[PDB]
Amino acid sequence: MSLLLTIAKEYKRLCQDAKAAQMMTVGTVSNYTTFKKWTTSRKEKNPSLRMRWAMSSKFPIIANKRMLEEAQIPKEHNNVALWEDTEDVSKRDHVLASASCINYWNFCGPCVNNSEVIKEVYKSRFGRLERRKEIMWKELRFTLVDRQRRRVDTQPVEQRLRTGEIKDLQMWTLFEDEAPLASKFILDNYGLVKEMRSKFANKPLNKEVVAHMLEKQFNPESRFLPVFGAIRPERMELIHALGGETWIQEANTAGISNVDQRKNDIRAVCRKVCLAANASIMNAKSKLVEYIKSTSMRIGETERKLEELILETDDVSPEVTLCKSALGGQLGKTLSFGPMLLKKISGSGVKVKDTVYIQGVRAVQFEYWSEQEEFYGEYKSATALFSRKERSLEWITIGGGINEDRKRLLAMCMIFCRDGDYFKDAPATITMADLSTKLGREIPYQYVMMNWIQKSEDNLEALLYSRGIVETNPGKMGSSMGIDGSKRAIKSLRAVTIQSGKIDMPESKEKIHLELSDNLEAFDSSGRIVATILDLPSDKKVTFQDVSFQHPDLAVLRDEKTAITKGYEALIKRLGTGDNDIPSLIAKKDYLSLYNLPEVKLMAPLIRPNRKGVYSRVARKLVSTQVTTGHYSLHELIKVLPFTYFAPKQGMFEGRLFFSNDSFVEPGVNNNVFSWSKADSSKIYCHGIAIRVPLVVGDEHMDTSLALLEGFSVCENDPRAPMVTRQDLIDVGFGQKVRLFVGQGSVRTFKRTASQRAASSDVNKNVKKIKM
């Protein structure tokens, strides 16, 4: 308004100068950032002394002037000085104010209607508070603690994201007029944005603070700390008040934040799909990728794509690793040999060949690495630090707390190093059948011996006996391990050391881009294997909740419900741009041409034939009623259209529309067959399966011009077309052009025509036509 005119006058005055003009004319807008640093640069060494000296004065702060005049803030109440007309050297528009002035405002001053929005701004810390309040403390005890050092997360966070996925989110919720082009993360996560937008809209707020708080709300604070007991963010956030080196304040904190359940579900799904793709013989790679992209799952309220969560988590499991490898997702340098965990500290080497005779004379190749290399190893409640040297386990130290876990870790380590005579001459018990190739897929002798151990405890005992045994020398009695896993004995194993106190887990902030084979075995720029499908449980049955396996092979429904779902899908795919589609017809109010679509003609056979006319009447009625005015709900037409194909008739409609399979849908209420919500207006739930509706038009429920972006696209710039805003963008015609401003210092030309095709397929298929 008048303020706008003042801004224009100021811009004019500033351009009248020469230097300001040169700088606002030369270069791009990014220079602003640079200019933001050359100004207001001043620091202090010990702000503490300076603060005390400074606050001692009688008007130590600065403050706005007009805000005080408007706030009718006087210069005294009962004789205490509150501010004095004057000018700071830096701001030039601020006045020196007293500490007493702040107190004055809070006690009696300018009241505001409401302030509960704060609870949303700092939601993380109110969550901390609530989690604390729901704890039941317990006694306090004194003792020594085995605190192991390791990298963990201290901030419980749902839907952990990246940074590039945030810099955009902070705009569509706060600064939409200055928003950039729509990124994929937005189009995919629409309901999330809508939620974050519903709260911080039409409110008096400082927005920079909100953005900072949102960054914290989406940042898992990763720290390298000493830890004891279970590992959960709910605890690490207050570990300081649970136990130290000499004391422990017992307390139960198991039933809060429901975090690890999501991770175990994810890993179960990963295992399932990995096995599924393994069922194949030549395309398990593409099969797995398809299973991935053909799947989704629910998190709290929202539905997220699997491949998106997989690239955000950090669960180092032999399942997640494979998936993240297929999708080209980089990851850390962490190994996996069966259930155990491993990490290399130093050393090097290279592959080498050797052979062993299974029964009598049966040569079988097995490989082993060359020079000395250190490794840390982590099994359940047990740690170890060992060294391998030319097909032998040189030394090892342990700091666990259990005998069974100790023995299992030791055995798996011995295997990992091919130490012993068994790798020189396998036992009679094993045979060529147990060797490999369940159905053709070979197996290295390593995992063979692995399962041979997991089969019987006596195999493990014999394997341990393969390691040298001697008499426990004096003094080393404490640092010795028997066959049962006892901290001391009269005779103990060879080259072993024990101790109380776990080993400090190493650390490295490194990333690597690995690959995998057609047999589901990943490689890392070397012949080393980081993961496989033999190091995971064999199989198990589970009933996954709030998941969407939208793939034929990964489906249990029959042809009837599947046909209904596919008919709905096809009917939705006509929700794009261009004439002959439902949006253009709605705009033209041609409610009749919808009845003659081909998709309804393909879904008609599924309708109950003895009452198809009556239902048809009702459906057409609703459609006209919604179309003639303009007050329609897109989630009801897509539901009732399949019935408008036949001819109306007479009869009593009793509230429900039945198909030929004794499954109905009701016009207005959500059911198992067709459900949706105003929260997530971009999804349709049919028989549990989810369907993503494109964003071409926005009906009464949808919000803020974020529901038209999938209908627009970029085109060659045309200076003839007009320039408009982001709100009038809805009044354009399908197929028209218009110029527009995007983000900052950028103008482009858009056209309301979509392009459903992506680049994956086009790149993937075209690359397959070149390897011939």
Binding site: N202, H631, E700, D703, T704, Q727
Partner: protein
């Protein structure tokens, strides 16, 4: 969205003096307060405001030709005195889905001598004893209540 944009959109270049109907359902109004309404709307005879986070009806301007109103899905409570002065020619009213506790809040509606039908559903008042009868004895001019007259006579379509 927002009642302002909704209104400006419904007004497809039409003056706010020749319309006979308006609808603003599935919108939002800051502080549950009307925004964009004036006395300019004179020929308006119908209104529909549903699920807009409304809480009070103080701001609504003077509308005489109005003869039907809908305020369901909101959380209005207490302000029914404003309806008499602003809209004295009203006949049909609906409040199902709002915060209504006692009858003292309903008493002002007696002055709407032009009132014929009222709709109270899902409110606390309905959970009382002798509520239909006591209401009828309070508002005698009224004939229909939630779609049913005395003796439970179902009302016609329209």
């Amino acid at each position: 969205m927002d009642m302002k944009k909704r209104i400006h959109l419904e007004l497809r270049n039409r003056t706010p003096s020749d319309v006979k109907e308006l609808v603003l359902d599935n919108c939002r109004s800051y502080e549950g307060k009307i925004e964009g309404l004036t006395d300019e709307f004179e020929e308006l005879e119908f209104l529909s405001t549903i699920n807009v986070g409304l809480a009070s009806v103080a701001n609504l301007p003077k509308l005489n030709k109005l003869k039907k109103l809908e305020l369901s899905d909101n959380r209005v409570s207490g302000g029914l005195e404003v309806l008499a002065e602003k809209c004295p020619n009203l006949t049909h009213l609906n409040l199902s889905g709002n915060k209504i506790k006692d009858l003292g809040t309903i008493e002002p509606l007696k002055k709407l001598e032009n009132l014929k039908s009222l709709d109270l559903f899902n409110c606390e008042v309905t959970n009382l004893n002798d509520y239909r009868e006591n209401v009828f004895k309070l508002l005698p001019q009224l004939t229909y209540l939630d779609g049913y007259d005395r003796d439970d006579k179902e009302a016609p379509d329209s």
